[PDB]
Amino acid sequence: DSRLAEAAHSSFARHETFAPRFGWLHKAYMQVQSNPEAFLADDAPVQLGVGKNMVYAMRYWSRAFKLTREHYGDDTNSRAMLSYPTWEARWLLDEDGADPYLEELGSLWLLHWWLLSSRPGTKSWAPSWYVAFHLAPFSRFTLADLTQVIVRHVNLSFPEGPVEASIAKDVDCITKMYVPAQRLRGGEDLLSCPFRELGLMEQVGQRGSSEWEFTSGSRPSLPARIIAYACLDYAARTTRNAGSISLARLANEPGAPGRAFRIREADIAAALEKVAASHQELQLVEAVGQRSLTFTSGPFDLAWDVLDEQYDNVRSRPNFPTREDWARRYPKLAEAEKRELKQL
Amino acid sequence: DSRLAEAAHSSFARHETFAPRFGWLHKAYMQVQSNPEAFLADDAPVQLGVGKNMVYAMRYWSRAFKLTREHYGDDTNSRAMLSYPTWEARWLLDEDGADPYLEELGSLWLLHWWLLSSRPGTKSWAPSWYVAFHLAPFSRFTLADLTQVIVRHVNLSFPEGPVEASIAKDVDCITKMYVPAQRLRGGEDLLSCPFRELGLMEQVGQRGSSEWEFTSGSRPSLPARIIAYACLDYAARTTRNAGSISLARLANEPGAPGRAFRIREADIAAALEKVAASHQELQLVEAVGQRSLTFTSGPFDLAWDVLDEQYDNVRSRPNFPTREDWARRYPKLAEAEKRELKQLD
Numbered sequence: 170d171s172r173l174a175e176a177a178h179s180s181f182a183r184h185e186t187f188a189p190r191f192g193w194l195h196k197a198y199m200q201v202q203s204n205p206e207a208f209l210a211d212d213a214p215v216q217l218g219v220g221k222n223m224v225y226a227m228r229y230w231s232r233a234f235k236l237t238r239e240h241y242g243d244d245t246n247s248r249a250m251l252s253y254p255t256w257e258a259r260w261l262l263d264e265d266g267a268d269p270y271l272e273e274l275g276s277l278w279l280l281h282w283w284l285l286s287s288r289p290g291t292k293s294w295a296p297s298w299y300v301a302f303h304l305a306p307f308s309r310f311t312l313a314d315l316t317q318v319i320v321r322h323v324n325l326s327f328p329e330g331p332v333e334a335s336i337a338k339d340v341d342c343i344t345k346m347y348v349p350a351q352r353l354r355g356g357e358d359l360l361s362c363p364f365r366e367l368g369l370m371e372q373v374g375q376r377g378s379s380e381w382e383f384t385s386g387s388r389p390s391l392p393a394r395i396i397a398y399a400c401l402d403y404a405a406r407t408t409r410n411a412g413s414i415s416l417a418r419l420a421n422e423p424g425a426p427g428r429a430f431r432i433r434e435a436d437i438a439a440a441l442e443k444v445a446a447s448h449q450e451l452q453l454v455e456a457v458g459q460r461s462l463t464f465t466s467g468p469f470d471l472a473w474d475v476l477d478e479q480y481d482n483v484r485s486r487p488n489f490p491t492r493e494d495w496a497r498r499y500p501k502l503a504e505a506e507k508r509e510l511k512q513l
Numbered sequence: 514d515s516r517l518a519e520a521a522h523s524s525f526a527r528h529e530t531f532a533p534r535f536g537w538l539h540k541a542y543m544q545v546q547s548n549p550e551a552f553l554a555d556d557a558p559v560q561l562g563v564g565k566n567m568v569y570a571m572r573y574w575s576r577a578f579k580l581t582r583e584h585y586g587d588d589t590n591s592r593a594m595l596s597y598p599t600w601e602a603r604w605l606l607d608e609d610g611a612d613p614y615l616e617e618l619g620s621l622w623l624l625h626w627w628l629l630s631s632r633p634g635t636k637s638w639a640p641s642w643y644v645a646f647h648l649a650p651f652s653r654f655t656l657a658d659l660t661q662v663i664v665r666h667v668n669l670s671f672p673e674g675p676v677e678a679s680i681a682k683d684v685d686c687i688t689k690m691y692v693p694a695q696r697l698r699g700g701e702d703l704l705s706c707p708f709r710e711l712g713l714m715e716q717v718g719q720r721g722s723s724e725w726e727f728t729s730g731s732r733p734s735l736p737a738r739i740i741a742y743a744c745l746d747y748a749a750r751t752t753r754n755a756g757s758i759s760l761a762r763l764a765n766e767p768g769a770p771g772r773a774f775r776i777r778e779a780d781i782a783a784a785l786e787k788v789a790a791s792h793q794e795l796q797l798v799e800a801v802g803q804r805s806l807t808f809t810s811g812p813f814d815l816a817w818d819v820l821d822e823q824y825d826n827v828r829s830r831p832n833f834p835t836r837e838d839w840a841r842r843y844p845k846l847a848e849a850e851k852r853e854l855k856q857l858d
């Protein structure tokens with residue numbers, strides 16, 4: 170088994186037991202935009218306004234949410250892994266972007282998709298999150314049961330061999346990231362975490378009992394265009410031209426929006442139907458008779474047409490850079506992608 | 514039944530049913546700091562980064578959370594109410610301040626207290642919230658129930674009166690502010706609201722059914738210094754000298770922390786023990802045999818010692834302004850307070 174090795178980097182507990190914070194995403198984008206050394210400077214804890222271990226966590230979460238890519242010097246400098254903002258970060262978090270203050274719940278659903286997402290050249294930095302949402306056998310678990318599940322997947326997927334204590338720390342942090350704070354004990358310490366608003370995870374049988382579970386209701390906070398974006402972005406993992414993808418695969422394949430968002434096939438179809446009605450190039454077709462999503466040109470570009478429309482077409486704004494503008498401004502983003510590729 | 518009139522201004526539905534947004538608090542502070550006309554300018558939507566239909570909601574929430582005050586400018590033959598940031602906003606929301614990005618849940622508890630709080634010279638801007646937390650005789654309700662208890666309290670307090678439709682909009686907004694996003698139904702519509710993390714309101718018994726309730730469990734996200742601040746801030750409403758206030762009043766009196774935070778007397782007692790252990794001027798006393806909190810000096814200054822401690826003593830940082838420094842930069846803050854105090858005929 171190497172579903173996981175093919176989708177995720179070997180990366181555990183680099184969040185340093187810290188769940189994401191809005192202030193960290195915001196401040197990381199602002200500093201890194203003009204300073205590649207913003208996380209590595211001896212200056213960082215005061216320049217970022219956080220403790221020293223929070224600097225690394227900030228750096229990790231930037232990487233994990235696909236808001237930055239890392240690559241060496243030179244100009245020398247060193248082997249130092251400097252950070253570079255992605256075009257998606259410029260699109261989302263810029264003061265001129267889609268949702269710089271994460272006012273819309275669809276933006277959190279989007280960031281959640283990027284944390285789990287993977288494609289050739291760009292794997293996930295949260296293998297424990299990927300196992301939990303895409304590969305775990307059961308919806309209810311103890312933290313030690315889920316920990317054991319990830320250990321077994323890491324053992325069959327990576328040459329290194331599992332660090333149980335680090336994987337246990339991922340499981341603590343998943344819990345803090347998705348579960349309501351009333352189901353947490355803080356020895357006051359308790360921090361906000363905006364991904365709790367997604368309602369993806371709950372305590373069970375609350376003593377609080379030792380068990381936790383992922384939910385399975387409807388997702389009124391998940392916008393249709395966010396589902397449609399993820400389905401077309403998932404289709405674009407393997408195709409760059411016109412074509413189709415079955416709804417069954419979108420609902421059930423590991424990596425796809427059904428498991429990422431924990432939504433049923435019917436909720437995917439309902440989102441795609443609503444979005445298709447506004448986009449001539451997209452249709453739901455019932456074949457033999459299973460439903461398929463069709464697209465008359467490459468699905469990556471249509472994905473971003475649907476996503477940009479959810480935020481009133483950010484790419485139309487004055488002086489908004491194109492991906493090709495961004496790539497020339499930050500050529501190391503492509504170089505980081507290439508070195509991921511030349512392992513395949 | 515003048516309780517609501519003494520506690521709250523006659524202000525209903527000015528938020529247009531938009532629940533608070535962190536970006537709204539943060540950007541309004543960044544702009545009002547240097548521009549008293551931030552909410553009135555032709556270019557407000559672009560400079561505040563919001564739609565034209567959101568500017569007033571944003572202006573309202575800043576005032577309601579005691580983050581701004583409003584007063585006429587120095588501009589003759591003009592009645593427009595200009596905005597000025599409060600010292601509390603400088604302490605909390607500045608990049609140099611306590612929690613500019615609302616990273617700690619105690620900051621949301623605190624903002625919630627500010628929304629509900631009331632003092633001679635600074636009443637609440639959220640009468641429907643005041644009624645819902647402090648005056649309603651029940652805790653479980655349909656939205657039509659909550660609307661009608663507010664309507665009943667408003668007719669006793671404000672002759673002028675909003676229309677019922679305005680109060681209903683307040684109640685929709687109360688719901689979206691506090692209940693989990695999974696209980697709401699949009700058109701996509703749903704916005705984040707960080708006050709939902711406080712776990713204060715939940716859907717109950719549904720189907721159908723149409724019921725809601727304020728919750729009543731334990732509050733592990735409510736820090737003890739936040740409780741003690743509110744208790745001392747509450748005592749300071751009526752006294753500026755050494756004195757005392759009973760735990761029963763703190764836990765049960767309308768306007769006090771027990772009803773604002775929906776916590777029981779023992780939870781208040783436990784928070785106050787923790788804080789009195791580091792504060793020799795605070796004590797929990799047994800009298801006959803009711804417990805009281807006592808303070809050997811003025812409660813308001815002790816309140817802010819306790820609150821500033823929760824955030825690592827922000828007032829000690831280099832160049833942090835005193836309230837005297839701030840009142841000289843923004844003289845109309847005191848003018849807006851004096852205006853309201855002389856409405857207390």
Ligand SMILES: [Mg+2]
Nearest residue numbers: 182183185225
């Ligand atoms: Mg480390």
Ligand SMILES: [Mg+2]
Nearest residue numbers: 565566567569
């Ligand atoms: Mg308006």
